[PDB]
């Protein structure tokens, strides 16, 4: 038993992290083949004030970049913007480039962060994309360019590169094609997040994890129909649940139907009455149904 937010192992991603610096700015990049992708604000003269990226590009000099893997430095032979990222061509192919694809993450999906500090992989942890295209991670100065990835089908996907933190602490990155999640700008300007919408699929998965782990105080002899729940969800910042089909095995193993847990969500969103669920004090939408199933029962 137990429930912990997991990361998938990091071994294929670690050899791809490089240190990229320009001027007094230092962050991380992703070295694949003979290319390094990193956030374009590494070339900005002053990241604390509004940046004219056309002027920064006009004044850039390739010899002002420093790119390195474990204190061995690479020659930079080309630099281009691609959206909000720089794409650098370097003079050596990464001999540890894994087979990989690029994909974009959608709201409610889980992935892994390899958090890196100035070119060194430091730590690995799981996150879940919020409705507004943000994640709640843990990023400080020096960790831009930290990389999000997910492995599915034994296919490794790179899905995230870290750029900024909003005023409310939410974290904003791009995909590896240089499109910023959520449409945020890579600018030190006040940008508002917008109302967070909880993933109903993930909150049901969480309550099933709680049941499996022996927590059941929130279940009562009450059950809420799917359409009734979806009507409530529309005015309570929860997503609509398309069907209960993803939960069939969990319902069978716990003896609790999804509609029993839809009624729990409605009651618990009002408040827990001072109780906790697996040491959470409010509903958690960071675990997907497949995530829970894999963690509780194996692949």
Number of C-alpha atoms within 13 angstroms, CB side, residue 122? 16
Which residues in the 127-156 window bind ligand A1EPZ by CB under 6 A? 139-141, 143-144
Of the residues 77, 141, 249, 252, which one makes contact with a copy of itself according to CB under 8 A: 141
Q: Are 145 and 30 in contact (CB under 8 A)?
A: yes
Q: Which residue among 16, 29, 38, 41 is the active-site one? A: 41
Q: For residues 212, 217, 222 and 228, what is the CA-based torsion angle, rounded to 10 degrees?
A: -70
Q: Are 278 and 3 in contact (CB under 8 A)?
A: yes
Of the residues 189, 222, 231, 276, which one makes contact with ligand A1EPZ according to CB under 6 A: 189
Helix (H) or strand (E) holding 252: helix 248-254
Helix (H) or strand (E) holding 164: strand 155-165
Q: Which residue among 29, 137, 142, 145 is the active-site one? A: 142
Give the closest residue to 244 by CA, choosing from 204, 291, 199. Answer: 204
Q: Of a copy of itself, ligand A1EPZ, none, which one does residue 186 interact with (CB within 5 to 8 Å by kind)? A: ligand A1EPZ
Q: Of ligand A1EPZ, a copy of itself, none, which one does residue 255 interact with (CB within 5 to 8 Å by kind)? A: none
Q: Is 144 part of the annotated catalytic residue set?
A: yes
Q: Are 179 and 103 in contact (CB under 8 A)?
A: no
Q: How far is the CB of 137 from ligand A1EPZ (least distance, A)?
A: 8
Which C-beta is closer to ligand A1EPZ: that of 41 or that of 69? 41
Give the closest residue to 83 by CA, choosing from 174, 215, 188. Answer: 174
Instruction: Give the residues lining the site for ligand A1EPZ (CB under 6 A).
Output: 1, 27, 41, 44, 47, 51, 139-141, 143-144, 163-167, 171, 186-191
Instruction: Give the residues lining the site for a copy of itself (CB under 8 A).
Output: 1-11, 14-15, 114-115, 117-118, 120-126, 136-142, 165, 169, 171, 213-214, 271-277, 279-282, 284, 294-299
């Amino acid at each position: 038993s137990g429930l912990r937010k997991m990361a998938q192992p990091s071994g294929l991603v670690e050899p791809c992290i490089v240190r990229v610096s320009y001027g007094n700015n230092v962050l991380n990049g992703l070295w694949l083949g003979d290319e390094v992708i990193c956030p374009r604000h590494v070339i900005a003269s002053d990241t604390t004030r509004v940046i004219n990226y056309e002027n920064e590009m006009s004044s850039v000099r390739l010899h002002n970049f420093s790119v390195s893997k474990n204190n061995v430095f690479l020659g930079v032979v080309s630099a281009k913007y691609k959206g909000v990222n720089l794409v650098l061509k370097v003079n050596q192919v990464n001999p540890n480039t894994p087979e990989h694809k690029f994909k974009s993450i959608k709201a409610g999906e889980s992935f892994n962060i390899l958090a890196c500090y100035e070119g060194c992989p430091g730590s690995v942890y799981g996150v879940n994309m919020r409705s507004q295209g943000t994640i709640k991670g843990s990023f400080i100065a020096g960790t831009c360019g930290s990389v999000g990835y997910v492995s599915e089908n034994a296919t490794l996907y790179f899905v995230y590169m870290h750029h900024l933190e909003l005023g409310n602490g939410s974290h904003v990155g791009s995909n590896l094609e240089g499109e910023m999640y959520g449409g945020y700008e890579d600018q030190p300007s006040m940008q508002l997040e917008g109302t967070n919408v909880m993933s109903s699929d993930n909150v049901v998965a969480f309550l099933y994890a709680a049941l499996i782990n022996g927590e059941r105080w929130f279940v009562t002899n009450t059950s809420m129909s799917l359409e009734s729940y979806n009507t409530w969800a529309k005015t309570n910042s929860f997503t609509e649940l398309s069907s209960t089909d993803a939960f069939s095995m969990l319902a069978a193993k716990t003896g609790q139907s999804v509609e029993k847990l839809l009624d729990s969500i409605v009651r618990l969103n009002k408040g827990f009455g001072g109780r906790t669920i697996l040491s959470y004090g409010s509903l958690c939408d960071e675990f997907t149904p497949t995530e829970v199933i894999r963690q509780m029962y194996g692949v």
